[PDB]
Amino acid sequence: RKRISNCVADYSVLYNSASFSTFKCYGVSPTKLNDLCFTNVYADSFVIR
Amino acid sequence: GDEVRQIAPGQTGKIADYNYKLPDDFTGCVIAWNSNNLDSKGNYNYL
């Protein structure tokens, strides 16, 4: 679990990058991520079947 | 083939937003089938 804070996050490149098999967002639209913003972001990365 | 799911109302993506967009109130049917035995060669005529 990695803390992300006190920085500017550009989700447009993450969205338009084709290297991701699945990019599906639940509580927020992926398009609107650039406008609205958060107190912190958590990136839980792991590998599974 | 993996972009077939993008052809649906309320969907977004590299295909659903740039080259082919359907209305959120789309009424109709979408029919697709693989063309691996017809279009595949390498076939570079599709962009």
Mark which residues 3-42 of B lie under 8 Å from A by CB.
12, 14
The approach used to solve this structure was cryo-EM
Please tell me whether residue B14 adopts helix, strand or coil conformation.
helix
**DSSP SS3 for B43:** coil
Structure tokens at A34: 């650039």
Instruction: Nearest by CB to B14, from A18, A29, A31: name it.
Output: A18
Asked whether the beta carbons of A5 and A42 are under 8 A apart, the reply is: no
Q: Which of A17, A9, A16 is closest to A33 using CA atoms?
A: A9
Q: Computed from CA positions of residues A25, A34, A31, B2, in that sequence, does the dihedral angle turn out positive or negative?
A: negative
Give the number of A-B residue pairs with CB atoms closer than 8 Å.
Answer: 5
Resolution limit, Å: 2.7
CB atoms within 10 A of CB A23: 15
For residues A7 and A47, give the distance between their C-alpha atoms in angstroms, rounded to a whole number: 26
Instruction: Name every chain B residue with its beta carbon within 8 A of the beta carbon of A16.
Output: 14
Distances (CA, A) of B28 to A11, A39, B4, B8, B9: 34, 43, 16, 10, 10
Per DSSP, the residues of A13-32 read: HHHH-TT-S----SSS-SGG
In this structure, what DSSP letter does residue A36 have?
S
Nearest to residue A25, comparing CAs of A9, A14, A10?
Answer: A14
CA atoms of B41 and A6, how far apart (whole Å): 51
Interacting residues of B13 by C-beta distance below 8 A, sequence separation 6+: B3, B6
Cβ contact, residue pair A31, B12, below 8 Å: yes
Distance (Å, whole) CA B18 – CA B43 = 22
Residue A33 DSSP code:
G
